[PDB]
Design an enzyme around this catalytic site. Structure first.
Site, mmCIF file in Angstrom:
data_model
loop_
_atom_site.group_PDB
_atom_site.id
_atom_site.type_symbol
_atom_site.label_atom_id
_atom_site.label_comp_id
_atom_site.label_asym_id
_atom_site.label_seq_id
_atom_site.Cartn_x
_atom_site.Cartn_y
_atom_site.Cartn_z
ATOM 1 N N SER B 49 0.826 -1.233 0.000
ATOM 2 C CA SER B 49 0.000 0.000 0.000
ATOM 3 C C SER B 49 0.857 1.280 0.000
ATOM 4 C CB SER B 49 -1.019 -0.016 1.127
ATOM 5 O OG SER B 49 -1.972 -1.074 0.954
ATOM 6 N N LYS B 52 0.271 3.331 -2.996
ATOM 7 C CA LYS B 52 -0.849 4.261 -3.145
ATOM 8 C C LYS B 52 -0.355 5.689 -3.363
ATOM 9 C CE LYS B 52 -4.442 1.407 -0.988
ATOM 10 N NZ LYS B 52 -3.724 0.152 -0.868
ATOM 11 N N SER B 97 -6.336 2.568 3.516
ATOM 12 C CA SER B 97 -5.578 1.685 2.591
ATOM 13 C C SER B 97 -6.573 0.828 1.806
ATOM 14 C CB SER B 97 -4.573 0.778 3.314
ATOM 15 O OG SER B 97 -3.567 1.499 3.987
#
Ligand SMILES: [Br-]
Ligand SMILES: [Br-]
Lengths: 244, 244
Positions: B49, B52, B97
Site C-alpha cells: 500500500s 498508493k 488503505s
C-alpha cells in the site's frame, strides 16, 4: 430540522474559564448551524490575526508570496514574542501569528488591491479604513462569527475569487491538529488594541464523511488565557460528539 | 558531512518489540542519511500500500481522480476490512488503505501509462510485470527504503513529472499526524503475498526549519503488530530528538 438552533448549555464552557462569548458551528452535510448566542453569532468584531487567512490568500494570488517555502527575513527589530525574532515562511508565520511578516505583505498588496480583494471575498464590512498594515488590528474592518463561517466555506470549496493553488496553500498553512479521528485547520486572533478585547478561533474540523465549520470569539480581559479559545471550542466539539 | 551513517543503537527499539527491520532517516537541510542497517536499507521489497502514493499521483494527473472529493462508490462486495465496505474519496481511501479503489484506478490507468509514469518517477525497479491491478502486491515491482526516500524527496519538492496540483493533493492525502511540534505525512503498507512478509511506514516529518524523510520496513508475520511500524519509527525519531 431548523437552519439555526440556539444551545445555551455551551455557556457553561465559557463560565468555567471565567469568560463569555459565542461558538458558531456549521454542519456542512446537513446545512445546519448551532450557536449558544444567536445575536453575538452576528456581532462584528476586529478580526485581528484571523485576518491572516485572507491576507495570505491575497499575497499568494498577487505573487507577493511565491510559495510556502519563500523566506521572509527578520527585519532585526527585537519584539516581545521570541518566535517573531527570526526568519519565517508562510507556514511558520501563520503558526506563530507573526504580525511583522503580514504587515510587510499588506504594504506590498497596497490599499487599492486589498480593498478590491475583500470586496470580491464579501469579507465582513469590507472596510480597510486606517493603516494598510494595521487595519485588521485597530482600523475599520469588522466581521461576525457567521461571516467568518461564510468566508471559510468558500475557502474550503475553493470558491474564493483567487487561484485554486492560493486556496490549497492557505489551507495547508491553516493545519493545526491531525490524528486518525479528525483534522483541524484554523487560525487564532487576539484583538487587544481596541475594546472590547476578544479572542477568536475560526476554521473547521474535517471528518471522514463531513466537515464542521466553526467560528468562536470570547471576552479576553488579559492575554493570560491565550489557550482558552481552543480549549472552549474543543469542549463544545466534544459535547456535540464531533471529536472524541 | 558524511553521506550515510549506520547507527546500530536503533536495533534496541527492534529488540524491545521482539522484531527485526530497518529505519532510514534523511536530514534534508544537512543532506545526510542515517540507518540501523545499511544493507537492509538498500534491499528492495514489494511496496504494497506504499504504492498508493505514486498510484494517487498518476490517477490525479491523468484525470482518473478529478479531486480529493470525488466519491468512489463501494462495489457492494463485502470484504473482511469493515472500513473498505463503504464509499471513499482519495483522503479516506489512503487513510484506510482501500485496495479495491486503487485496483480500479490502476485498471483505468492501464499498463502502458502506469509503466511510463513509474519510469518518469524513477520509482524502485520501475517493473509493473504481472496484473496492472495487483503488481504492487504480487507482481514484479520492488523498492528499497533508500529508493522510497529518493521518490518522497521529489514529491516534497514538487519535482515529479506530474502537475504541482497532483503533488499538493497527494501530500494532503498523506497527512497522518500534526500538532504544535511536527507534521507527519506518510503511508503504511503490509506485503503478505510473497515472503518475507513486511510492514512499511514511509514519509516525512515537517519541522519549523527542517524536513526529516523516513522509510522503514520490518518483518511482520501477522497483522497483529502493524502498529509497531509507527511505534518503532517514533522511538528512533525521539532518540534522535527530531520529535518530543
Ligand atoms: Br493547485
Ligand atoms: Br495539508
Amino acid at each position: 430540522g431548523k437552519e439555526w438552533q440556539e444551545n445555551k448549555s455551551w455557556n457553561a464552557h465559557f463560565t468555567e474559564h471565567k469568560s463569555q462569548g459565542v461558538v458558531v458551528l456549521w454542519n456542512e452535510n446537513k446545512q445546519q448551524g448551532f450557536t449558544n448566542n444567536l445575536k453575538r453569532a452576528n456581532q462584528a468584531f476586529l478580526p485581528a490575526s484571523t485576518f491572516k487567512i485572507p491576507n495570505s490568500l491575497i499575497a499568494l494570488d498577487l505573487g507577493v508570496v511565491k510559495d510556502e517555502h519563500q523566506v521572509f527575513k527578520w527585519d532585526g527589530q527585537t519584539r516581545d514574542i521570541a518566535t517573531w525574532n527570526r526568519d519565517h515562511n508562510l507556514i511558520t508565520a501563520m503558526k506563530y501569528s507573526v504580525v511583522p511578516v503580514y504587515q510587510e505583505f499588506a504594504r506590498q498588496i497596497g490599499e487599492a488591491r486589498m480593498s478590491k480583494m475583500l470586496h470580491a471575498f464579501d469579507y465582513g464590512n469590507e472596510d480597510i479604513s486606517g493603516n494598510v498594515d494595521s487595519f485588521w488590528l485597530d482600523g475599520g474592518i469588522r466581521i461576525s462569527a457567521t461571516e467568518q463561517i461564510s468566508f471559510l466555506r468558500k475557502l474550503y470549496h475553493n470558491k474564493l475569487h483567487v487561484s485554486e493553488r492560493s486556496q490549497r496553500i492557505v489551507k495547508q498553512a491553516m493545519l493545526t491538529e491531525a490524528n486518525g479521528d479528525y483534522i483541524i485547520r484554523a487560525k487564532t486572533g487576539y484583538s487587544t488594541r481596541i475594546e472590547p478585547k476578544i479572542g477568536w478561533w475560526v476554521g473547521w474540523v474535517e471528518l471522514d464523511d463531513n466537515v464542521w465549520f466553526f467560528a468562536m470569539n470570547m471576552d479576553m480581559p488579559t492575554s493570560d488565557g491565550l489557550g482558552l479559545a481552543q480549549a472552549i471550542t474543543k469542549e463544545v466539539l466534544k459535547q456535540e460528539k464531533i471529536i472524541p
